Amino acid sequence: GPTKAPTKDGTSYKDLFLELYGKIKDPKNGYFSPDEGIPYHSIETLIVEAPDYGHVTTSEAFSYYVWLEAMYGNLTGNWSGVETAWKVMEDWIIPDSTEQPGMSSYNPNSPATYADEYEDPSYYPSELKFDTVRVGSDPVHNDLVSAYGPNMYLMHWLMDVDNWYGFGTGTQATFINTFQRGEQESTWETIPHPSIEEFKYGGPNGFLDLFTKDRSYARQWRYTNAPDAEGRAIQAVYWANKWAKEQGKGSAVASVVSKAAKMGDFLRNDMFDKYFMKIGAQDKTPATGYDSAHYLMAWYTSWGGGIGASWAWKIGCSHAHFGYQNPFQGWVSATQSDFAPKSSNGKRDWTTSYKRQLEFYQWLQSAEGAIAGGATNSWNGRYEKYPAGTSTFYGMAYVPHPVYADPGSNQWFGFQAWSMQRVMEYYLETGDSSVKNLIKKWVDWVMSEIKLYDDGTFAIPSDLEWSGQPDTWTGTYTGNPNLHVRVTSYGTDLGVAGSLANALATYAAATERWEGKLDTKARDMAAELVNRAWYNFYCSEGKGVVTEEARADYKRFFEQEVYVPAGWSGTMPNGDKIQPGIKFIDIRTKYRQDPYYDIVYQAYLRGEAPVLNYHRFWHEVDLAVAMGVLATYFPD
Ligand SMILES: OCCOCCOCCOCCOCCOCCOCCOCCOCCOCCOCCOCCOCCO
């Protein structure tokens, strides 16, 4: 568990980085799968967050792995880690040609069939509306095909690394999905299913008719990205390239740079309305050309096609969260020669996008300084009319919690750190004064909310509450006097503390570079966060840092009803019956063999929250990269 670090006082941030790096990479510690070398969500298996099992992982984890290795190359001159990390990503979570059969049959003039989204999972399956609803046209596909051929070079968002659900073979890493039934489907409320749907498992039509209603069903494959992962990966590779070339070792990462540029080009798919409807339509009004482009990183792009028959489809997404933007990666794709898109229009599109993203952050900045949630081009996920008085951004409606409501997607303070960290890197590398007010207001805000205790502990915001709306955007920040944040709780989340330290140190470095005076308070706060995270949460088992958390939410293992339509029946691969009346655990009965099951169940029987220790991959990496940023800009 967490203990006071034995580390000698005054240990350099470089030395801290290299110690923590070593512990992350040590095979005995178990952060990576023995067979593929894929980073798990966490060492521990019983954990329920975005993934619902700890050895399920996400494209996020793959991106953090690349970032870790880039910093290692910076500090040691050894670039093999970057090569290895990108290879693991490309080999596993980026679907290859055999895994995207028939994508060459995609028709950009008939991209997909329309379906409503709904406010509760019990409304699903959602009817596919063939020939009742016309959709718009995809203006980027052919430009990408001309450069790269038929397939998407993006990461699917979720992978069952040791085939725990059984949808794949042996213990092989397997593409899966969970979330599918709208904004109120929490992680506790999903029915896990295979991305490659061969009807082997589930019901007669596999899992398909839990989610979509149609006259017939065909075997099919489907992937969905999370563009913050790709963005982070590319961001990392910008730094790998910069640092490697400083060392005269740019050739070691040149191939990875080319792949990152390509991935960046494919992220243009995330810039479009779900069904290529006109931005601002407030109706199901199909667009052509770029009239469906919001030029933000929306929550996903998804694509799919047939197995055993040749057909394909693609959707964007109408919802954008500030937390998923990355104007740094955008600027890299737009402006950096080595990352120049191979397609004819990628550079232009990215130039438009990174600037639009920067406006988005400004529009969303509350009176206090925290960044509010985002916007949608599809009110209620059904292209409904905006309510009276709705504030807008280029025709998109403000929403405080884009995409998901259980919990509200902008309650989590962590998005402030993850996303504004990218804005700091953008300011550092450009000195663009257009974002100075944004970043200074956010820094002064966040630093007013960090608590440093005389006993050497710390607290940072954990949960946020929002009221009001920004003013409608006309190109200039108004101060948004009626958009308000309140911090409702604080905590010691190690990864957020690291990300925040990263943001503050990067900002400090930028102030030194551009402003003629270093913000030493920002520098020092970054140092304090790293120091206090490391010192108070050092893992006694030598695995890095570790949390100790009461998980009151884990009563949902046993209490959460999972919606199944009346009359539907099927089985999970292990034989668990999927039918009305199931709870979370009932379709995941292998959890009863987890080494921490008894602790969680016995706590439940006592009416108590169980207390668990976790080593999340992204926690370890966000802290390590923060140590590295300090080492880079503030050595000694
Ligand atoms: O010719 C016949 C063809 O007909 C066939 C029809 O084919 C169908 C095609 O269209 C189908 C329409 O389907 C709609 C698809 O939309 C659903 C998308 O669902 C997948 C979305 O995946 C995204 C998952 O999102 C959840 C991830 O959120 C994580 C939040 O991040 C926060 C992480 O921070 C950790 C916090 O830690 C807290 C610890 O205290």
Author numbering: 28 to 663
Task: Quote the paper.
Family 48 glucosyl hydrolases (GH48s) are exoglucanases that attack cellulose chains from the reducing ends to progressively release cellobiose molecule, thereby playing crucial roles in the hydrolysis of crystalline cellulose.
A high-purity catalytic domain of the native Cel48S protein, termed ctCel48S_CD, was obtained from the extracellular proteins of C. thermocellum after one-step affinity purification. The crystal structure showed one molecule in an asymmetric unit. We observed conformational changes of three important residues: the substrate-binding residues R249 and Y431, and the catalytic residue E87. The side chain of E87 deviated approximately 3.7 Å from that of the substrate-bound rCel48S_CD, which resulted in an increasing distance (from 2.8 Å to 6.0 Å) between the carboxylate oxygen of E87 and C4 hydroxyl of glucosyl residues at subsite + 1. The side chain of residue R249 in the ctCel48S_CD structure showed apparent conflicts with the substrate based on the published rCel48S_CD-oligosaccharide complex structure. Because the ctCel48S_CD structure was substrate- and product-free compared with the published rCel48S_CD structure, these results indicated that the residue conformation of the Cel48S protein may differ as the substrate-binding status changes, indicating that induced-fit effects may occur between the enzyme and substrates.
